[PDB]
Amino acid sequence: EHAKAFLGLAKCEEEVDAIEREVELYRLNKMKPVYEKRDAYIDEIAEFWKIVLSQHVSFANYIRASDFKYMDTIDKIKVEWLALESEMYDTRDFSITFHFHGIEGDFKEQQVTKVFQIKKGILTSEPVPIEWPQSYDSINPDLMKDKRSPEGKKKYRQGMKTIFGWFRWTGLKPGKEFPHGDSLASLFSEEIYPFCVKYYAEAQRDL
Amino acid sequence: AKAFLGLAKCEEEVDAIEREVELYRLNKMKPVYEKRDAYIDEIAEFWKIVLSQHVSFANYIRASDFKYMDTIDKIKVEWLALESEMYDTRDFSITFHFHGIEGDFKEQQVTKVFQIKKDGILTSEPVPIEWPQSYDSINPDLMKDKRSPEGKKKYRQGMKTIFGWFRWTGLKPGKEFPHGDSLASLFSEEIYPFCVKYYAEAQRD
């Protein structure tokens, strides 16, 4: 037709994009209190997270076999959507907090929060401190004296492939960090945390 | 055990909230689509262009159907959950207005309804539509012979046309228009919601 129509169709599209974010915010606002109440019940189920993480179909493929003993110490996982804090954040942005009860003589009891947010878009993050297990001293990047050597590079990559390497993932150095750090982050915010109860129930039906 | 009971209740609330969010979206989008479609009724061959621009739509119908699809000057999808709580938020009706082709395809408006039956599957009911005279030999309601090898070929040809799709129900696997459910979702999930995008993309080329 003419231009006058193409214009109306232009403003309509912008009204649609605005509606979509309003809808996402609407959902986030409604779900926040339900998660709080749900997580209160979860905090009363020992090894809830260990069971959920084992039931997930692909979680295990992201971390090293040896990491599981440390993952088993997770007492709580909490995901919070940042768009609820400010419209300056994408509705896909979230922080994830882990509480590890630790292992005497090997892994420190600690709480760690990592923040994921969209840039220019793709998920990105900043490194967050976490006390690696003593067992990992030889593959720990901050204790790694020899990274250059062909034997050092091997150990370096090994450490970077552990869940602890994921905590320093940023998404800004393609191929240089923990592999698929963004996919793992999305796994937590879109599948593991939202549907943990469904996974747990499934593990129950299996006696 | 009181925890498991609490979790069960939370999951129930989650499902209730998801429906509420979907209805919230549907209600907000309704007036926008109405205004949008008003501007659309001002662009000639709008739908003809969108349907030819879509990447997979043409793969669902027969080449011979293109000329009839080109006569569509109006497509309207309506979500039934806005009508009642007994409809799934995925249930919808799609209304087509064909301008027709004189002496071959009658000018007509047809509405087909798609609804979930049990996470459930999309189903529909046959809806009346006047097939083109050119399709007389492959029209299931006119064919006398649907048994011979030749009669069966003509039968299948007709059932694979867009007119056979209006007859699709999703309740007779392997006996109806192929992938009638995917085509339906194409309309409600891509073609109708993003038609304007397809129209702009067609302008550049």
UniProtKB/Swiss-Prot annotation, chain A:
Disruption phenotype: Decreases acetylation of histone H3 'Lys-9' and 'Lys-23'. Simultaneous disruption of GCN5 abolishes acetylation of histone H3 'Lys-9' and 'Lys-27'. Abnormal protein sorting to vacuole.
Regions that span the bilayer: none
Keyword Protein transport: yes
Main location: nucleus
GO cellular component: chromatin; cytosol; H3 histone acetyltransferase complex; nucleus
UniProt entry keywords in alphabetical sequence: Nucleus, Phosphoprotein, Protein transport, Transport
GO molecular function terms listed in the Swiss-Prot or TrEMBL record: acetyltransferase activator activity; chromatin binding; histone binding; identical protein binding
Superkingdom as given in the UniProt entry: Eukaryota
Keyword Signal belongs to the record: no
Domain description: The C-terminal part interacts with the N-terminal part of histone H3 and promotes acetylation of histone H3 'Lys-9'.
Note: Present with 3120 molecules/cell in log phase SD medium.
Complex formation: Homodimer. Homotetramer. Forms a complex with RTT109; consisting of a VPS75 dimer contacted by two RTT109 subunits. Interacts with RTT109; the interaction is direct. Interacts with ASF1. Interacts with histone H3/H4 heterodimers and heterotetramers via histone H3.
Annotated protein name in UniProt: Vacuolar protein sorting-associated protein 75
Full-length numbering of the shown residues: 10 to 223 of 264
